[PDB]
Amino acid sequence: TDKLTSLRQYTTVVADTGDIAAMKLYQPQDATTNPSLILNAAQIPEYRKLIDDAVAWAKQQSNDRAQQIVDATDKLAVNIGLEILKLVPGRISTEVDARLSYDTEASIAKAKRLIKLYNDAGISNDRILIKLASTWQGIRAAEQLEKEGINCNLALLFSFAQARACAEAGVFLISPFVGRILDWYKANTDKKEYAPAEDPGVVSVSEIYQYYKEHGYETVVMGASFRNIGEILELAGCDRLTIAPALLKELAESEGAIERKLSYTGEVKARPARITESEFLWQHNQDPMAVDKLAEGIRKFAIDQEKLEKMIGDLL
Amino acid sequence: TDKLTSLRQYTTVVADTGDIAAMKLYQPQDATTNPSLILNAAQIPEYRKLIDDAVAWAKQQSNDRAQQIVDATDKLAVNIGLEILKLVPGRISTEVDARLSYDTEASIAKAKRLIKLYNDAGISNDRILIKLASTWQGIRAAEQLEKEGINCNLALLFSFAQARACAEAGVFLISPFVGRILDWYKANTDKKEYAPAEDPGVVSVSEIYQYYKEHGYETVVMGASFRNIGEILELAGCDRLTIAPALLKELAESEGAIERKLSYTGEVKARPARITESEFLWQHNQDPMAVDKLAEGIRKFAIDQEKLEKMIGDLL
């Protein structure tokens, strides 16, 4: 058989795109989106109807142009998620405005607003994951949201300190960014080529996976952002993996069964005391790669958010 | 006349070293030290007596080896400052353990401990500046200390967000790191050579200086960490400048008067509302250079702190 089919025996497959065409082709269980993917998806001609509906709906909610742009941009992200939910049996991840990444209160409010839009469309919370950046503020926001019945996807996770803090907060799921970790090492290190087993991103997710299973944490581990299928195969066994259409295609076209790589067969160990903000900050900042990438990821998503608002603005 | 003498007409000269030999040669008003300089100073043979006194004193304060190492390391930094105060009429800057940079409470306690050691030696607070890293936690610590009569030197300042937060906290003085800003641009940018006037570090300090004088902030602006005398000359007029002995030598050996570069001749403008933690974090992290350098600076100072403790440990 092919790699994609074989991978499904050990890992839940998730598609990383806002394009419904991939949902039909690969039949993933869940789907993930982010500001950059939503921006690209808005370029898709067939998605024109989703944009028009969003704008129309927004103009019917208020007469304030400022609020209309916000309502239209949020509704568009929700409309795309709604189309995807028609093709997948699992969940859709929708990301909150990245500009609120360092504001716990504003992030909680925004998350509840998105949940509201999905609920107004008849979709219940169990089909959604609100995606936020894994800053200390984002984690604190998520801890609160989970208590109120809103499951979260903690993304842009790079350091072990972030992983630990997320598990202790009891979040539904985490998305460590494998490929971006590799990117950093290629650019800031002498070594430019890595064997799959030595890929920094792979090693990072593997250690996180072990730490989580070893202590009985229920937080789902979902590797994300890949550069090649080698990273994916090396993580076979990870709870879930969200993969871009291009890599999904390569897996489906390659023959040969694969073997499970990630497993924890021991018994559960006792959990340590919770890490504090001070310890979190010290440990996170001890990681040059994590320091750079977390801040950078947030900057890029914020820019894409602004570009989308610009686009919507010219339609009002 | 020479450059050094001319510079003194517009700017207060400060020596950046723990070596008393430079104090006698350049007669600076104040002197600054940091963990790296304290470590180097401990290598100076004539400083052997200062180390022995520190160790002896520590063993007389307690019988706990753990506490002795801490007492010995703090006393050594204070002993070096005490030697310098005999040669300078102004202040000495002594830095708190960098490992506490993200812990407000621990930083306040450590600062008070150092103040205690100086007071036990008969030195009053007006001759000292407690130096801390400009993280949000360090700034909050400083705001509290200033209220209790302890003046601070907010260092490792890179972003405008840090500068603004420091002025609003009412700190006694800030130390923006000019040379390290240049280092980042040389390494992460295409352009490797900068004219003094276009030096990123110089432009940064100039904008900070303007912002401070324009709003009537009393916080002293002291440019620090230089790579060449060009940066120094381009900042003539800055409240103070702390310069390494090597650059101090170059200024003294070069002939020719210099002209004042930094000045604010307008009237004071009203101050804006205070920046919040969320806004501070968003703005600071918008600066790729500041993100990298602040975290890196703290990492290096922490390592030097550990090396000093190692050294002291083998003497107990």
Q: Which of A3, A75, A131, A261 is catalytic?
A: A131
Contact B232, B251 (CB under 8 A): yes
Token pair belonging to A190: 């002498």
Give the separation between CA B37 and CA A66, rounded to whole angstroms.
Answer: 54
Taking CA atoms, A259 is separated from A2, A84, A220, A253, in Å, by: 13, 30, 21, 17
A154: β partners: A132, A174
Quick one: chain A helix, strand, coil %, rounded to 5? 55, 15, 30
CATH for B1-316 is 3.20.20.70
Residues in chain B within 8 Å Cβ distance of A156: none
Give the separation between CA B254 and CA A10, rounded to whole angstroms.
Answer: 72
Contact A209, A221 (CB under 8 A): yes
Q: Across the interface, do A106 and B281 touch by the CB < 8 Å criterion?
A: no
Give the separation between CA B289 and CA A35, rounded to whole angstroms.
Answer: 24
Residue identified by tokens 């992030």 is A107
Helix (H) or strand (E) holding B15: strand B12-16
Token pair belonging to A167: 């598990």
Q: Which of B278, B308, B295, B263 is nearest to B135 (CA)?
A: B295
Contact B297, B180 (CB under 8 A): yes
Confirm whether B293 is a catalytic residue. Answer: no
Q: Are strands B92-95 and A220-223 parallel, antiparallel or unpaired?
A: unpaired
- Nearest CB among A277, A278, A292 relative to B292 is that of A292
Residue extents of the structural domains in chain B: 1-316
Rounded to a whole number of angstroms, the distance from the CA of A102 to the nearest CA of chain B is 5
Residues 6+ apart with CB under 8 A from A2: A251, A252, A253, A254, A255, A256
Residues in chain A within 8 Å Cβ distance of B103: 278, 282
Query: Which ranges in B127-276 belong to alpha helices (H)?
Result: 136-147, 160-168, 178-188, 200-214, 229-234, 245-253
Q: For residue B132, which amino acid is it?
A: L
Contact A247, A225 (CB under 8 A): no
Contact B223, B205 (CB under 8 A): yes
CA dihedral B165, B170, B171, B175 (to 10 degrees): 50
Q: At what angle do helices A48-61 and A288-313 cross, to 10 degrees?
A: 80
How many A-B residue pairs are in contact by the CB < 8 A criterion?
47
Specified resolution (Å)? 2.0
Contact A206, A235 (CB under 8 A): yes
Burial class (CB in 10 A: 0-12, 13-18, 19+), B211: middle
- Nearest CB among A278, A282, A292 relative to B291 is that of A292
Looking at the complex, does the CB of residue A309 fall below 8 Å from at least one CB of chain B? no
